[PDB]
Amino acid sequence: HITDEQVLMTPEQLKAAFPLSLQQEAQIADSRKSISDIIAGRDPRLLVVCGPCSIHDPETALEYARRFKALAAEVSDSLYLVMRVYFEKPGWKGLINDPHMDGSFDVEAGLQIARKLLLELVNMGLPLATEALDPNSPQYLGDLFSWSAIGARTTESQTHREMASGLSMPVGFKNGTDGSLATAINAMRAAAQPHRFVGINQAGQVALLQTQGNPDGHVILRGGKAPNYSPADVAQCEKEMEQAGLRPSLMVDCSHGNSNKDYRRQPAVAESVVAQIKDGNRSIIGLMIESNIHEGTDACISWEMTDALLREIHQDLNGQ
Amino acid sequence: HITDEQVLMTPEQLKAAFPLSLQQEAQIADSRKSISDIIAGRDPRLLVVCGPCSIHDPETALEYARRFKALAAEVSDSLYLVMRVYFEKPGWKGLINDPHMDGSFDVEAGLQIARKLLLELVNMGLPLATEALDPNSPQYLGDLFSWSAIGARTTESQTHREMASGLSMPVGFKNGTDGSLATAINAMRAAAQPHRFVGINQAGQVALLQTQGNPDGHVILRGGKAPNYSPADVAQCEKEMEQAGLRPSLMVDCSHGNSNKDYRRQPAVAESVVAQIKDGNRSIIGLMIESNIHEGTDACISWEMTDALLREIHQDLNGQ
Structure with missing residues (x-):
């Protein structure tokens, strides 16, 4: 049986508690546009999504972000640095589903802490990247990221191609775990199309969502059974x-x-x-x-x- | 009459005895480029030249440098920390013209001790700033600094605008002691132009030096009879x-x-x-x-x- 039933904080309440300023929203929009122009080939700079394997401490993330921002200011001519802030990975649940590391699973506190950290990172003037595992998490934090990635067993799932068509950011689709490029290509093609699926609204209610489609897509060559970064695999x-x-x-x-x-x-x-x-x-x-x-x-x-x-990549990419 | 005539150690001999490594020279070049990009407006970080009023002890300088390096690693996202190492100021002469504090004026020992200290500071990965008073001193130690300042009664002097056009580092020109901005502006404009003057070569010989000019210039608002940091004076x-x-x-x-x-x-x-x-x-x-x-x-x-x-400046400059 089910004993207790306690409503979670809605995306509206969360965004009202930890709000974006108009300037930060404009900055996120500018970074999304710049990344999409890089993907489309209109921007000569090379996109570089770099960051911690997974985030499980706000202070570690902030120190890494200070170093990352100091570095990006020196390689900004050739490279466009985007920091990946990865909380939950596909034991402990990773600071959103369990921010107290004691199995209490205080999801409200986790969402608030994650939003506070992301707001501090955006305030530093840093574009953020994420990997959406929970299809409903972009309703809570998606307004803070400039780039998203769709995973291995996640790509072939149709719920995630629909959610990708619903996202507002540039998006990279990872190939199959078996090295299949067709799955990534098909998810990228389907995410470019409008979709109608079952998600949650900003009031935390189950709802039917309609999406225009995401035209800013690309493939993530992740490697399967064998690496696929060689010029032959790229071709x-x-x-x-x-x-x-x-x-x-x-x-x-x-x-x-x-x-x-x-x-x-x-x-x-x-x-x-x-x-x-x-x-x-x-x-x-x-x-x-x-x-x-x-x-x-x-x-x-x-x-x-x-x-x-x-530094080596920046120094070698000069001619171009 | 003149009794004794003893040749001073040349810049070639001094640099051979206390040499820069290739890595440290690349570090100095990188810091010079970063400072120049800050000056030009291409780098968002704020330049901060900070350090002792004057250096008269290598141990004190090293302790200050350890603290300064530890602090710079924590404010690197917003601020770019440069340590001023000022030896001789415009009694005792300041560790270069008199390292033994007894009027012996052992200039060779002073140059060697200064170069050893500066090399240790550079080895700590710290960009250094200086104020050139002796026009020929940049030929001995100038390879070690990332930023230089040109002084009050030094700015209107043409020898120093020529020497500034000969420097390899970013350069700031102080306004007049009477608050005159025209002197600093004209010195900055002239240092950007090529110049031909009488200086010394790396062999310690009097020579005619030709200079491309220094395009990395800026004004130093130092205050004259009244402070000039207010928004009106800045405008x-x-x-x-x-x-x-x-x-x-x-x-x-x-x-x-x-x-x-x-x-x-x-x-x-x-x-x-x-x-x-x-x-x-x-x-x-x-x-x-x-x-x-x-x-x-x-x-x-x-x-x-x-x-x-x-810390306060770093915490307040976050939005930008």
Whole structure:
């Protein structure tokens, strides 16, 4: 049986408690537009989604964000840095479903703390990236992010392509865990179309939502059974995107698939992408980097390696 | 008559005895580029030249540098911290012309001790600032600094505008002791132009030096008979810079002129500058702060006040 039934704080109440200013909303809109122009090929800068493997402390996230902002101010001519703020990953639930780390599962406090942290990060003038797992979480925090990613077992799910068609931000779809590009391509094509699904409204009520569709989409080359960052795999992805009637636009993830979840191989992947760009590649739009304060249960690279790698990429991409 | 005639150690010999590594030279080049981008308006961070009133002990300088580096790592998102290492000021001569404090005037030992200290400071990853009084001293230590200032009775001197056109670092020109902005503006305009003067070569020989000119210039609002940090004085400086065909780019010195050489008024000047930035000021590029370990024959602020003031500026500049 069900014993207690206590209403959760609605997205309206949450956004009223922790509100965006008009300036911050304009900044988020500008960053969304810039990322979408990068994806579309109208902006020469390379998109770089980089950040912690997962966020489980606001103070660690703020220190990483200060270092990240200081670095972005120095590589802003060639690279466009976006910080991924990943709370819940697909034990402990990750600061939103359990902010007290004691199984209490205080979801109201978790939502408030996450929104406060994201508001502080946006106030620093930092575009944010996320990976939507809960289809209803973009109703609570989606107004704070400038870029979203759709996952492996999440891409083929139709609920998530509908939610992606409902999102307001540029969006990258990851290929299949078996390396299937067709799933990502089809999710990208379907997210560009209007959709009608069952979600929640801003009053926290179950509702029927209608979506125009998301025209700002791209593929995330994540690697499956084998890495797919080589020029041959990139050309095959371009071929499949052209056959599907889409403009070749892909982001290479230096993380889990293309490095076998090993930290030492991420800079090599980034350097291969840079070399491909030097040889005239036109489809590679961005990179994805998992990087925490220290090296080392995901294998995220150290901050010293992140600084060195982004400096090398910035220094090598000058001619273009 | 002249009795003895002993050759001084040349810049080549001094740099060979205390050399920069390639990595440290690249670090100095990166910091010079970052400071110049801040001055030009391409970098959003605020330049902050801060440090001891004058250096007369390597150990004190190293302790201050450790604290300054620790603090810079925490305010790096909004502020760019540059440590002024001032040896000789315009009795005792200041550790270069008299490192033994006994009138022996061992200039070789002074140059070597200064270079060793500056090399240790650079090794800590700290950009250094200086004020060139001797026109030939930049030939011995100039490779170690990222920013230079040109002084009051030094600005109108043509030898120093030539030497500034010869410097490799970003440069700030102080207004006249009578508050004259025209002197600083004209020195800045002239230092941007090539020049041919008499100086010394790396072999310590008198030579004719030709200089491309220094395009990284800005005005230092130092205050004259009255302080000139108020929004009205800032607007007047912007007006005189625009009339001279220059982009308005100025640094506000919280020290001698704008505080009447009183330590208690520096944070108030800094807070006025922050308030001006909040009201939409676009010309103010940085601050200058004289701060030693303890309070109190220049009136430099204590390190506790320096920490508090930089933290307040960092916390107030967040929105931008």
